[PDB]
Amino acid sequence: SCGAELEANALLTALVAGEDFTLPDIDMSGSEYDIPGGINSPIYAEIEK
Amino acid sequence: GTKDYIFILDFADLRTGVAFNGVTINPRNITMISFDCTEAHHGLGKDAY
């Protein structure tokens, strides 16, 4: 195998060092990103003429 | 396979059908609510296929 993956990891760590790149940590399933009601909300009720 | 069941009548989402595929009753005008009670032998009832 010769560990091509190890060489790639070491090279990437050495070449980009000296800077900070931190991705955001939002969790998009926390119920703050959903429309409030389920099927029971009046959005899904039939509209009368 | 059970003998502990409940019958729930919800006046929202009243769908008229054998398989609940039909027009929906308007809850805002209802005159009476009569439960249909029959026997097992009512009109070739139980064992027809």
UniProtKB/TrEMBL annotation, chain A:
Top-rank lineage group of the source organism: Viruses
Designated name of the protein: Gp54
Residues of the full protein shown: 2 to 50 of 299
